[PDB]
Ligand binder design. Structure first.
Ligand SMILES: Nc1ncnc2c1ncn2[C@@H]1O[C@@H]2COP(=O)(O)O[C@H]2[C@H]1O
Length: 247
């Protein structure tokens, strides 16, 4: 969690919006509903652009603020909406009025693409827009484990790929001898490969994959997979999809 810096970055941005867009955060009436001291997502993005390269970048910045609590949706939704009908508030107490803004924009922009990729991934398979599938596809272009596959194939994987986050190191993902149900790509983190006979046989890092032996050979898992770091993030492909798309 880099939550503390996002917050102060958000706090820093929040100060320059009130100064540059004095009527961005106001009372609003939508469908005869009244929302106090809020802004629309679409106008929030607009205002961030007005400060002074792309809209998708700014959308990523907003997603990052929503994620770290530096921005909160009126209707408690987790995907940021670049829309007129969606309203957001800054939280925390009012900050003091107004290079620090520059580095606050950079820190937020650095995390934007991942924030937007996570939203696409958190969308269950079959409920992904072409734009979300577009984001997941471009990510597979950066994964060593699938580089030898065709774009058509990567596209198929994007359609069925499953997002599987974890938090604690030392978690046993599956054990030697278990029925093999799924293929795994390491988006973030690393894992230990442990066999009963030799102990730690190897370490896999971001961009590697594991768990195909059990699917390809119709056999029990040949090793225990243990999370080596905090916050491992996996892309998972279930057996049926793996077999249909990789056999
Ligand atoms: N030396 C190794 N022995 C066995 N499995 C390994 C080894 N190195 C990496 N692996 C991976 O560990 C996985 C454990 O489950 P699988 O047998 O399905 O697929 C295996 C491989 O992807």
């Amino acid at each position: 969690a880099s939550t503390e810096r996002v917050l102060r970055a958000g706090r820093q941005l929040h100060r320059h919006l009130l100064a540059t867009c004095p009527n961005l955060i106001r009372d609003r009436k939508y469908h005869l509903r009244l929302y106090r001291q809020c802004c629309s997502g679409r106008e929030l993005v607009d205002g961030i652009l007005a400060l002074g390269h792309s809209r998708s970048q700014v959308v990523g910045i907003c997603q990052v603020l929503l994620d770290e609590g530096a921005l909160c949706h009126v209707k408690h939704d987790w995907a940021f909406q670049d829309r007129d009908a969606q309203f957001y508030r800054f939280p925390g107490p009012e900050p003091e009025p107004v290079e620090e803004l520059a580095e606050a924009v950079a820190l937020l922009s650095q995390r934007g693409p991942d924030a937007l990729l996570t939203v696409a991934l958190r969308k269950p398979p079959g409920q992904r827009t072409d734009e979300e599938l577009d984001l997941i596809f471009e990510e597979l272009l950066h994964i060593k484990a699938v580089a030898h596959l065709s774009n058509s194939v990567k596209r198929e994987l994007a359609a069925v790929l499953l997002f599987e986050p974890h938090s604690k190191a030392g978690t046993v993902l599956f054990s030697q001898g278990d029925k093999g149900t799924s293929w795994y790509i390491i988006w973030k983190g690393s894992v230990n490969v442990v066999t009963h006979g030799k102990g730690l046989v190897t370490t896999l890092h971001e961009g590697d994959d594991f768990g195909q032996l059990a699917l390809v050979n119709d056999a029990p898992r040949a090793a225990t997979i243990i999370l080596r770091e905090d916050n491992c993030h996996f892309l998972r492909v279930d057996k049926q999809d793996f077999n249909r798309i990789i056999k």
